[PDB]
C-alpha cells in the first residue's frame, strides 16, 4: 500500500496548486511507467481535481486516467487517516554534538503531519524518560512542544527502553482501532549493558499494542542494533539521508493506514 509521493507535495491534495497538479502528473508518469501525459491534461488546482469523476479522468487521459484517479484516492485516503506518532528522542551524552540533527528531523516531520486526525507526542530519554509533549493534535501545544525540545541539553546514559515505555503507556490509554499508532526512535544506536536486551524486549510490547516502530539513526550508528528495535530493516532510516530518508519514512508511515 506504499505510495512514493514526492516530499514537496503537501499531504492533503485540496491544497495542491495548479503547479502541484502538474508536478504530480510528471511524477506519476515516471513512477508508474505511464504513457506520455500532457502537462496540460488537468489545468486546475487540487480542489478542482477532487471534483472530477473517474470517467472525467478517463476522458482526459484515455491511457492513464483510471489509474490516476485511483492513485488520487489512495493519496487522499492516507491523508485523512488517523495517526498517533510518538517520537522517542535520545538525549544522552552520545548525541551532544547531534541534538541539531535529531531536532530538525522531528520538526521537519511534525510540520508535515498537519491533518486534523494526526496527533503527536514528544518523549525524551537519557538515564530517565520524560514526556515533553503529551499526545495531541493541537498545533498550538505542539509548537510549545517544539520550543521546549530546542532547549534540551543532551546528558546521561542511553536508556532507550525507558523512552519506549512512556510511548507504550500513552498508547495503552488512547490507542484505538483505525488509529495507526507509530513510534519513531531517533537514537545513535550505542547501547551499553542490558539496554540492548530491554530495548528489543520493549519494542515488542509496542508491536504487541498494534504500534509500528521506526528507528532513525544519527551520525554514526549501529545498523544491526536498530534493525532489532524497528519492525523490519525497511523501517530504519539514516538522518543524514537528508530530504531523501525524510521522504522515505513519511511514506512508510502513511502506508501503515
Ligand atoms: Cl484533502
Ligand atoms: Cl551514553
Ligand atoms: Mg548513546
Numbering used by the authors: 1 to 257
Task: Pull verbatim passages from the article behind this deposition.
Fusion to TELSAM increases the crystallization rate and propensity of the human ANTXR cell adhesion molecule 2 von Willebrand factor type A (vWa) domain. The vWa domain was chosen because it has been successfully crystallized previously, has a known structure and is only moderately soluble. We determined that the vWa domain could be flexibly fused to TELSAM with a linker consisting of a single alanine residue. This construct included the critical TELSAM V112E mutation that makes TELSAM polymerization pH dependent. Two molecules of the vWa domain separate adjacent TELSAM polymers, and there are no direct inter-TELSAM polymer contacts, a feature not previously observed in crystal structures of TELSAM–target protein fusions. The inter-vWa interface buries 491 Å2 of solvent-accessible surface area and is largely hydrophobic, with minimal polar interactions. Leu 194 from a vWa molecule packs into a hydrophobic pocket formed by the Trp 99, Ile 100, Tyr 103 and Lys 150 of a second vWa molecule. Asn 104 additionally makes a hydrogen bond to the backbone amide nitrogen of Leu 194. This specific inter-vWa contact has not been observed in any previously reported structure of the vWa domain. In view of the fact that a flexibly fused target protein can find a rigid conformation relative to the TELSAM polymer by packing against the polymer, the rigid hydrophobic connection between vWa domains suggests that, while direct inter-polymer contacts are dispensable in forming well-diffracting crystals, a rigid transform between adjacent TELSAM polymers is still required.
